[PDB]
Design a protein around this ligand. Structure first.
Ligand SMILES: [K+]
Lengths: 140, 49, 137, 238, 60, 31, 157
RNA sequence: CAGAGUGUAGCUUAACACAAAGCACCCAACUUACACUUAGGAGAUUUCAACUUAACUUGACCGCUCUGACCA
RNA sequence: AGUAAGGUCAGCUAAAAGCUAUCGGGCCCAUACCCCGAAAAUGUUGGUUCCUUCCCGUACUACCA
């Protein structure tokens, strides 16, 4: 009995494992349904020209933003390297200790800015949370 | 299978320069490749590698 | 039996310890461009151009033409930049280029080609046709 | 020993609290993207419900069959009106705080949309100089350890800071003004470490006006020329 | 631009007519052939008069 | 910052219409 | 040929990594970091995907090896609210949470601060940035469950 | 604040002229994403005087980087 | 020694079933029989989707001087 259970467990371990499907990429049948299809409205020549000009300006703006980000990263890297070189020249031991990795650096969690600051006088209402996530299992 | 005409030899049109199971020599100028990787001369001249 | 290479072997400067780190020819176009450049570069081993490539005298061909004209490069560049800026500022040109309906004046293009690049193209065509080989040896 | 004095400084920065307002170009791009999404999208459940309600109202008006229109009892437009009324009743928070109007550079509540950097005023040679918080390095202690100890040496602050790495992000070297220039003490070399202000602030007693939280643009008002030039190299304003 | 490619094709077709090059070949990659710029250039050359397919060699 | 990748649209070929909505957290902030 | 100076001029497999017909988690050195995972969590799928794409492009431009770019299963949660003057919590709404994961490796100790600062400054609103160390636990959790295996293990117990 | 070195957009010993080039970079479509491809965009000779000619040689004026002064 | 073939619930057979063994009920004064309900496996390895490695046991030959 024990040997048979071990054999079954080994067989199931050898059996391949299936990844959980992603509903973000899976297209539901609601989209396939033709009722949700809407009539299409053509765009005027002026609207198309304005969209093209806006796209060109946006391309230039994104190029400028990328240039600014690259310059900032380069400045940070140069400053850090110069500081490390100065620290090494002044005292090699401190530089050697500083160039080591930080094990406490990567339990990293950060939240982005909110549209509005939290309201001190806000009182959240009473409610309940229910999880209806579809559980996917592999058998046989 | 091997080279039938070494470098500097004189060949005519259609002479089989070489035959190979896999591509060891590739067809060059005025050299054709057969159905079974057979390099033959399309022009009368001198073989060069 | 082994014989050392006469010169530097191909791909002898690519480090193999950083194979993953080195950038790759992700585009067939870049691979083909590099291959063409390498083929154009001379090599000590036997090559196709050695036997089939045309062989010419190493001496430079003696010029027997008129002295070249003199053009103010700075002024020419400034004028061309101003003309291009005016053309791009013209809104009709931008919309025509965006809608793929613009064209060029063939007569003006040919006149400017004759004035600027015409003699050199004619000389190249004459060299291809072999006139200088026969007329002036 | 060494002629230079080892000093470790801390670049305490509060990240922006609210999102930066969009430029007009970004607003136009967002409007275009929303319009494209609406044009290329399919009918939503709400749109289908509204269309079905309109069709059933037309059926009620024209034909005798009514189907009782229980769904049309509460129309989609009526639900939209109720949602709009609820949104109007609800009030959002104020992005611009009283500190922005007061120009009080001691409170963290000002300029929630931009990153802030902390500066402290210390008296050197009977002269008040605004610098980043700093301490003097000690044997058997890392430079990052000194930077962390600067927080402890700060007066009446309850704050949590997250240090990023161990390598300093910048340095500034200066020499004495011939008042105490000596072979033993030629000058000093401060090193800066960037940290993130997760939570906390100073106490009421600590808010005595000796510390200011300022942006990169106004950092030069308090910092010296050379000190500001060195600090701006690693302090970003993206 | 595609207009630039078409203009280059037209100018080159006229120059080839002037030089006597009435036949030639083109060797495009699949993506270049599917590209609209190369299609416009080929159309311009053909309308100018250049044939993009050389006649077969006579062996007898 | 946020504006670097805030301007987005649905990349799915087929997708229902989505309405922009302000979401209010328990502390008073909104997204 | 072997005897000729031009021997082995056509070698190509030495320039190409072995064409193998799961993966050991690399651990960084004293000045390097191991394989890390950046799983951005957001209620907006479009924002999450856009920021994941931005992070991947930034890593490619900064020459940081991106091991993988995938997504975790969407979590669907029903948010309910208690009705006024009643004792029943009606279904207020339904929300979806998405988690776009970028698996990278080879991050330098010195450049780690700069990379984290950039990716936290560029973080969009409503998106939570979470950088952790890649684990076999997470790799297995990416997969489904095996109730038959669970039952057999319980029987073995 | 002074003394040096110093000069094409990001890089190049690209620019003989016929000409300011190649590569790098960004946006749009496909791609989970990356990548490839298709379709679009932005760029520079720091400024003057010297066979006027000269990005190119020679000097000033600028800009950049170090070195000293100043320095908490 | 070299040739062939088998290994299946606890036992024995079959192509994933049957009879007993066993658990839990019923009848019985109580057991046995009987009736009802169940759990109970392809020796094993790696494949292909039937072969094959190893282990256990089985049969035959191992001769002519
Ligand atoms: K052959």
């Amino acid at each position: 009995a024990k040997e048979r259970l071990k054999r079954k467990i080994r067989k199931l371990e050898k059996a391949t494992q299936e990844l959980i499907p992603i509903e973000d990429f899976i297209t539901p049948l609601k989209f396939l349904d033709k009722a949700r299809e809407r009539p299409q409205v053509e765009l005027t020549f002026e609207e198309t020209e304005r969209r093209a000009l806006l796209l060109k300006k946006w391309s230039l703006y994104k190029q400028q933003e990328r240039k600014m980000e690259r310059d900032t990263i380069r400045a940070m890297l140069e400053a850090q390297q110069e500081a490390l070189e100065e620290l090494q020249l002044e005292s090699p031991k401190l530089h050697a200790e500083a160039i080591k990795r930080d094990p406490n650096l990567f339990p990293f969690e950060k939240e982005g800015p909110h549209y509005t600051p939290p309201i001190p006088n806000y009182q959240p209402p009473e409610g309940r949370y229910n999880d209806i996530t579809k559980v996917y299992t592999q058998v046989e | 299978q091997g080279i039938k005409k070494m470098e500097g030899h004189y060949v005519h049109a259609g002479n089989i320069i070489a035959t190979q199971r896999h591509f060891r020599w590739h067809p060059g100028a005025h050299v054709g490749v057969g159905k079974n990787k057979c390099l033959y001369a399309l022009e009368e001249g001198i073989v060069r590698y | 039996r082994r014989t050392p290479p006469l010169g530097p072997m191909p791909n002898s400067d690519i480090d193999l310890s950083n194979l993953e780190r080195l950038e790759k020819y992700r585009s067939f176009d870049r691979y083909r461009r590099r291959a063409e450049q390498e083929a154009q570069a001379p090599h000590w081993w036997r090559t196709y151009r050695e036997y089939f490539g045309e062989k010419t005298d190493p001496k430079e061909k003696i010029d027997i033409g008129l002295p070249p004209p003199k053009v103010s490069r700075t002024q020419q560049l400034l004028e061309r930049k101003q003309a291009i800026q005016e053309l791009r500022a013209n809104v009709e040109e931008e919309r025509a280029a965006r809608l793929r309906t613009a064209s060029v004046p063939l007569d003006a293009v040919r006149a400017e080609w004759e004035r600027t690049c015409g003699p050199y193209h004619k000389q190249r065509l004459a060299e291809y046709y072999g006139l200088y080989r026969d007329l002036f040896h | 020993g060494s002629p230079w004095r080892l000093l470790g400084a801390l670049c305490l920065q509060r990240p922006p609290v609210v999102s930066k307002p969009l430029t007009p170009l970004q607003e136009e791009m967002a409007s275009l993207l929303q319009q494209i999404e609406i044009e290329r999208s399919l009918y939503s459940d709400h749109e289908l419900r509204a269309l079905d309600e309109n069709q059933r109202l037309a059926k009620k008006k024209a034909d005798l069959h009514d189907e009782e229109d229980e769904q049309d009892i509460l129309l989609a437009q009526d639900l939209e009106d109720m949602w709009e009324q609820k949104f109007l009743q609800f009030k959002l928070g104020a992005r611009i705080t009283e500190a922005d109007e007061k120009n009080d550079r001691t409170s963290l509540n000002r300029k929630l949309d931009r990153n802030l950097v902390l500066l402290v005023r210390e008296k050197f040679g009977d002269q008040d100089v605004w610098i980043l918080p700093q301490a003097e390095w000690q044997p058997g202690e890392t430079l990052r350890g000194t930077a962390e100890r600067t927080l402890a040496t700060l007066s009446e602050n309850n704050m949590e800071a997250k240090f990023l790495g161990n390598a300093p992000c910048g340095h500034y070297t200066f020499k004495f003004p011939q008042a105490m220039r000596t072979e033993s003490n030629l000058g000093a070399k401060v090193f800066f470490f960037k940290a993130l202000l997760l939570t906390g602030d100073f106490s009421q007693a600590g808010n005595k006006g000796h510390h200011v939280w300022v942006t990169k643009d106004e950092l030069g008002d308090y910092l010296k020329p050379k000190y500001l030039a060195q600090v701006r190299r690693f302090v970003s304003d993206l | 631009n595609v207009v630039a490619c078409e203009s280059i094709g037209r100018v080159l077709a006229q120059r080839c007519l002037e030089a006597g090059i009435n036949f030639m070949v083109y060797q495009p990659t699949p993506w270049e052939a599917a590209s609209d710029s190369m299609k416009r250039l080929q159309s311009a050359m053909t309308e100018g008069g250049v044939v993009l397919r050389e006649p077969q060699r006579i062996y007898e | 910052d946020s504006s670097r990748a805030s301007l987005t649209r649905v990349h799915r070929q087929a997708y229902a219409r989505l309405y922009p909505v302000l979401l209010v957290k328990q502390d008073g902030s909104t997204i | 040929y072997k005897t000729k100076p031009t021997h082995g001029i056509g070698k190509y497999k030495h320039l190409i990594k072995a064409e193998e017909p799961v993966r050991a988690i690399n651990l960084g050195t004293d000045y390097e970091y191991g394989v890390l995972n950046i799983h951005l969590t957001a209620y907006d799928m479009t924002l999450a995907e856009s920021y994941a794409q931005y992070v991947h492009n930034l890593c490619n431009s900064l020459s940081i090896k991106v091991e993988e770019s995938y997504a975790m299963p969407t979590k669907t949660i029903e948010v309910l609210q208690l009705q006024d003057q009643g004792s029943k919590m009606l279904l207020d709404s339904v929300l979806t949470t998405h988690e776009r994961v970028v698996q990278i490796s080879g991050l330098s100790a010195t450049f780690a601060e700069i990379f984290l600062e950039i990716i936290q400054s560029s973080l969009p609103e409503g998106v939570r940035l979470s950088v952790k160390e890649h684990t076999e636990e997470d790799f297995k959790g990416r997969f489904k469950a095996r109730p038959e295996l669970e039952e057999l293990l319980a029987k073995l117990k």
